[PDB]
Enzyme design. Structure first.
Site, PDB file in Angstrom:
ATOM      1  N   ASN A   1     -39.226  12.722 -41.448  1.00 12.89           N
ATOM      2  CA  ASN A   1     -39.995  11.556 -41.849  1.00 12.89           C
ATOM      3  C   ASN A   1     -41.348  12.097 -42.310  1.00 12.89           C
ATOM      4  OD1 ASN A   1     -41.808   9.386 -41.932  1.00 12.89           O
ATOM      5  ND2 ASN A   1     -40.771   8.298 -40.271  1.00 12.89           N
ATOM      6  N   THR A   2     -41.539  12.210 -43.622  1.00 15.12           N
ATOM      7  CA  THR A   2     -42.707  12.923 -44.161  1.00 15.12           C
ATOM      8  C   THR A   2     -43.971  12.062 -44.116  1.00 15.12           C
ATOM      9  OG1 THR A   2     -42.033  12.443 -46.475  1.00 15.12           O
ATOM     10  CG2 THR A   2     -41.401  14.555 -45.593  1.00 15.12           C
ATOM     11  N   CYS A   3     -43.770  10.736 -44.112  1.00 21.65           N
ATOM     12  CA  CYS A   3     -44.853   9.755 -44.001  1.00 21.65           C
ATOM     13  C   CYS A   3     -45.681   9.952 -42.732  1.00 21.65           C
ATOM     14  CB  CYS A   3     -44.305   8.325 -44.019  1.00 21.65           C
ATOM     15  SG  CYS A   3     -43.575   7.800 -45.579  1.00 21.65           S
ATOM     16  N   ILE A   4     -45.046  10.436 -41.670  1.00 24.84           N
ATOM     17  CA  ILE A   4     -45.770  10.729 -40.433  1.00 24.84           C
ATOM     18  C   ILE A   4     -45.722  12.206 -40.016  1.00 24.84           C
ATOM     19  CG2 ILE A   4     -45.762   8.386 -39.488  1.00 24.84           C
ATOM     20  CD1 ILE A   4     -43.258   9.297 -37.745  1.00 24.84           C
ATOM     21  N   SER A   5     -45.147  13.056 -40.873  1.00 24.79           N
ATOM     22  CA  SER A   5     -45.026  14.509 -40.616  1.00 24.79           C
ATOM     23  C   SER A   5     -44.209  14.781 -39.356  1.00 24.79           C
ATOM     24  CB  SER A   5     -46.404  15.184 -40.548  1.00 24.79           C
ATOM     25  OG  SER A   5     -47.036  15.192 -41.821  1.00 24.79           O
TER      26      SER A   5
END
Length: 88
Positions: free
Chosen positions: A62-66
């Site tokens: 989930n790259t939005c929250i690393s």
């Protein structure tokens, strides 16, 4: 500075072992592998969720929250294989 969220259902000795395996692999990565890893994890050129064991599933992010998701693999060799396969 990365925090771990234990969603694995597995025991503390197994979790500790896996954590050791992971950082060992990351330590030994080439510059190109490390760049591929950070991009996969964060989408830029903090946390890991360890999921229940599944040797046929790749890590995801989930790259939005690393946040990297990684199944608690049964061996260091499998971890290395699927992490390298996922990021390339």
């Amino acid at each position: 500075f990365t925090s771990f969220n234990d969603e694995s259902g597995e025991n503390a000795e197994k979790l500790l072992q896996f954590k050791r395996w992971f950082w060992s692999i990351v330590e030994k990565m080439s510059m190109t592998e490390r760049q591929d890893l950070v991009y996969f994890w964060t989408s830029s050129p903090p946390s890991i969720t360890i999921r229940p064991p599944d040797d046929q599933h790749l890590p995801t992010a989930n790259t939005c929250i690393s946040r990297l998701y990684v199944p608690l693999y049964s061996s260091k060799q499998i971890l290395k294989q699927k992490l390298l396969l996922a990021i390339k």
